[PDB]
């Protein structure tokens, strides 16, 4: 069935674009990280990772 989207209709019948972003948070090789910045790789010292 087709929609009757018209600007005359008020709230409840207007077209609303819905975007569903499905993510995968399990431990696996990821390539969609947030920008940020890469630092130096120190070793043999108690540091954050």
């Amino acid at each position: 069935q087709s929609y009757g989207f018209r600007p005359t209709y008020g709230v409840g019948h207007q077209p609303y674009r819905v975007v569903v972003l499905s993510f995968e948070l399990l431990h696996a090789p990821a390539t969609v990280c947030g920008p940020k910045k890469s630092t130096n790789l120190v070793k043999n010292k108690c540091v954050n990772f």
């Binding site: 399990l26 431990h27 696996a28 090789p29």
Partner: peptide
């Protein structure tokens, strides 16, 4: 054409990536 065999210890795979 068709035969019936049995897998003894095969058919296992890695479930996760850990």
């Amino acid at each position: 054409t068709q035969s019936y065999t049995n897998s003894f210890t095969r058919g296992v795979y890695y479930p996760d990536k850990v």
